[PDB]
Amino acid sequence: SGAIYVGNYRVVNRHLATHNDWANLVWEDSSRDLLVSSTTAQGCDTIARCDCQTGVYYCSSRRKHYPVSFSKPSLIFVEASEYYPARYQSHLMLAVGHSEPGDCGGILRCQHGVVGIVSTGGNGLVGFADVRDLLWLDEE
Ligand SMILES: NC(=O)[C@H]1CCCN(C(=O)CC2CSC2)C1
Numbered sequence: 001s002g003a004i005y006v007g008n009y010r011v012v013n014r015h016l017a018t019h020n021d022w023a024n025l026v027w028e029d030s031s032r033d034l035l036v037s038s039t040t041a042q043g044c045d046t047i048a049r050c051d052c053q054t055g056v057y058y059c060s061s062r063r064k065h066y067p068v069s070f071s072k073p074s075l076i077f078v079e080a081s082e083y084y085p086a087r088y089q090s091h092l093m094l095a096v097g098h099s100e101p102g103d104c105g106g107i108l109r110c111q112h113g114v115v116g117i118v119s120t121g122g123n124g125l126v127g128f129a130d131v132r133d134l135l136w137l138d139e140e
Protein backbone atom coordinates (compact mmCIF):
# COMPACT_ATOMS: atom_id res chain seq x y z
CA SER A 1 0.00 0.00 0.00
CA GLY A 2 1.03 3.67 -0.30
CA ALA A 3 0.18 6.93 -2.01
CA ILE A 4 1.71 10.21 -3.25
CA TYR A 5 0.20 13.31 -1.57
CA VAL A 6 0.88 16.37 -3.79
CA GLY A 7 -1.20 19.55 -3.49
CA ASN A 8 -4.84 18.48 -3.08
CA TYR A 9 -4.32 15.16 -4.86
CA ARG A 10 -3.80 11.59 -3.66
CA VAL A 11 -2.12 9.30 -6.27
CA VAL A 12 -2.64 5.55 -5.71
CA ASN A 13 -2.43 2.29 -7.66
CA ARG A 14 -5.84 2.01 -9.42
CA HIS A 15 -6.15 -1.62 -8.27
CA LEU A 16 -5.84 -0.49 -4.56
CA ALA A 17 -8.21 2.53 -4.80
CA THR A 18 -10.84 2.74 -2.02
CA HIS A 19 -14.55 3.67 -2.26
CA ASN A 20 -13.64 7.15 -0.97
CA ASP A 21 -11.07 7.47 -3.84
CA TRP A 22 -13.73 6.50 -6.46
CA ALA A 23 -16.28 8.89 -4.85
CA ASN A 24 -13.75 11.82 -5.06
CA LEU A 25 -12.21 10.86 -8.43
CA VAL A 26 -10.05 13.26 -10.44
CA TRP A 27 -8.54 10.87 -13.07
CA GLU A 28 -7.94 7.15 -13.61
CA ASP A 29 -6.19 5.04 -16.25
CA SER A 30 -6.29 1.25 -16.14
CA SER A 31 -3.48 0.93 -18.76
CA ARG A 32 -1.11 2.77 -16.34
CA ASP A 33 -2.51 1.29 -13.04
CA LEU A 34 -3.04 4.82 -11.72
CA LEU A 35 -5.91 6.68 -9.99
CA VAL A 36 -5.95 10.19 -8.55
CA SER A 37 -8.52 11.42 -6.01
CA SER A 38 -9.02 14.83 -4.35
CA THR A 39 -8.03 15.58 -0.73
CA THR A 40 -9.18 18.11 1.86
CA ALA A 41 -5.66 18.63 3.32
CA GLN A 42 -2.57 19.71 1.29
CA GLY A 43 0.19 17.16 0.81
CA CYS A 44 3.99 17.50 1.13
CA ASP A 45 5.33 15.41 -1.71
CA THR A 46 6.80 17.21 -4.78
CA ILE A 47 6.79 15.55 -8.24
CA ALA A 48 10.12 15.19 -10.08
CA ARG A 49 10.20 16.90 -13.53
CA CYS A 50 13.39 15.37 -14.91
CA ASP A 51 14.96 12.51 -16.90
CA CYS A 52 16.64 10.59 -14.00
CA GLN A 53 17.10 6.80 -14.49
CA THR A 54 18.57 6.27 -10.98
CA GLY A 55 16.77 6.77 -7.69
CA VAL A 56 15.59 5.05 -4.49
CA TYR A 57 12.35 3.15 -3.79
CA TYR A 58 10.56 1.99 -0.62
CA CYS A 59 10.01 -1.77 -0.21
CA SER A 60 7.44 -2.44 2.54
CA SER A 61 8.21 -6.23 2.57
CA ARG A 62 11.79 -5.36 3.69
CA ARG A 63 11.13 -2.07 5.61
CA LYS A 64 13.94 -0.65 3.46
CA HIS A 65 14.70 1.96 0.82
CA TYR A 66 16.87 0.56 -2.02
CA PRO A 67 18.90 2.45 -4.62
CA VAL A 68 17.99 1.33 -8.15
CA SER A 69 18.69 1.92 -11.85
CA PHE A 70 15.43 1.86 -13.82
CA SER A 71 14.39 1.81 -17.46
CA LYS A 72 12.64 4.68 -19.27
CA PRO A 73 8.80 4.63 -19.18
CA SER A 74 7.63 2.08 -21.75
CA LEU A 75 4.86 -0.33 -22.81
CA ILE A 76 5.72 -3.63 -21.00
CA PHE A 77 3.89 -6.94 -20.98
CA VAL A 78 2.04 -7.67 -17.60
CA GLU A 79 1.04 -11.17 -17.12
CA ALA A 80 -2.17 -12.13 -15.74
CA SER A 81 -3.19 -11.22 -12.24
CA GLU A 82 -6.08 -11.18 -9.97
CA TYR A 83 -6.06 -7.34 -10.82
CA TYR A 84 -5.66 -7.36 -14.61
CA PRO A 85 -5.75 -9.76 -17.54
CA ALA A 86 -2.65 -10.30 -19.73
CA ARG A 87 -1.94 -6.95 -21.20
CA TYR A 88 0.56 -4.19 -21.83
CA GLN A 89 0.85 -1.60 -19.10
CA SER A 90 2.01 1.71 -20.31
CA HIS A 91 4.38 4.28 -18.75
CA LEU A 92 6.05 1.47 -16.72
CA MET A 93 9.74 1.49 -15.66
CA LEU A 94 11.56 -1.72 -14.58
CA ALA A 95 14.44 -2.26 -12.15
CA VAL A 96 16.10 -5.18 -10.38
CA GLY A 97 14.82 -4.90 -6.90
CA HIS A 98 13.07 -7.16 -4.61
CA SER A 99 8.97 -7.15 -4.63
CA GLU A 100 6.34 -9.33 -3.34
CA PRO A 101 2.73 -8.94 -2.79
CA GLY A 102 1.81 -6.20 -0.33
CA ASP A 103 4.18 -3.98 -2.36
CA CYS A 104 2.34 -1.67 -4.58
CA GLY A 105 2.36 1.94 -3.65
CA GLY A 106 5.89 2.43 -2.38
CA ILE A 107 7.47 5.64 -3.70
CA LEU A 108 10.35 5.79 -6.19
CA ARG A 109 12.19 9.15 -5.90
CA CYS A 110 15.26 10.95 -7.21
CA GLN A 111 17.00 14.24 -6.11
CA HIS A 112 14.16 16.20 -7.86
CA GLY A 113 11.22 14.58 -6.09
CA VAL A 114 8.78 11.71 -6.56
CA VAL A 115 9.18 9.78 -9.83
CA GLY A 116 6.45 7.10 -9.47
CA ILE A 117 4.97 4.21 -7.38
CA VAL A 118 5.65 0.51 -7.31
CA SER A 119 3.04 -1.10 -9.58
CA THR A 120 4.90 -4.41 -11.02
CA GLY A 121 7.44 -6.87 -9.84
CA GLY A 122 8.59 -10.48 -9.08
CA ASN A 123 11.51 -12.90 -9.70
CA GLY A 124 13.44 -9.95 -8.72
CA LEU A 125 11.55 -7.52 -10.77
CA VAL A 126 10.04 -4.34 -9.46
CA GLY A 127 8.24 -2.04 -11.98
CA PHE A 128 6.91 1.37 -11.37
CA ALA A 129 4.28 3.56 -12.67
CA ASP A 130 5.76 6.84 -13.81
CA VAL A 131 4.02 10.11 -12.85
CA ARG A 132 6.59 12.67 -14.19
CA ASP A 133 4.54 13.42 -17.35
CA LEU A 134 1.36 14.31 -15.30
CA LEU A 135 2.07 18.02 -15.21
CA TRP A 136 -1.39 18.90 -13.93
CA LEU A 137 -0.52 17.35 -10.51
CA ASP A 138 1.44 20.63 -9.85
CA GLU A 139 -1.60 22.96 -10.12
CA GLU A 140 -5.42 23.47 -9.52
N1 LIG B 1 0.26 -3.50 -12.31
C1 LIG B 1 -0.16 -4.77 -12.44
O1 LIG B 1 -0.70 -5.23 -13.39
C2 LIG B 1 0.10 -5.57 -11.17
C3 LIG B 1 -1.15 -5.76 -10.28
C4 LIG B 1 -0.80 -6.50 -9.00
C5 LIG B 1 0.07 -7.75 -9.22
N2 LIG B 1 1.20 -7.44 -10.11
C6 LIG B 1 2.46 -7.60 -9.68
O2 LIG B 1 3.42 -7.50 -10.39
C7 LIG B 1 2.64 -8.00 -8.24
C8 LIG B 1 4.03 -7.54 -7.80
C9 LIG B 1 4.61 -7.88 -6.45
S1 LIG B 1 4.17 -6.18 -5.76
C10 LIG B 1 3.87 -6.07 -7.65
C11 LIG B 1 0.76 -6.92 -11.40
Ligand SMILES: [Zn+2]
Pocket residue numbers: 048049050051052110111112113
Ligand atom coordinates in the same frame (compact mmCIF):
# COMPACT_ATOMS: atom_id res chain seq x y z
ZN1 LIG C 1 15.36 13.54 -10.98
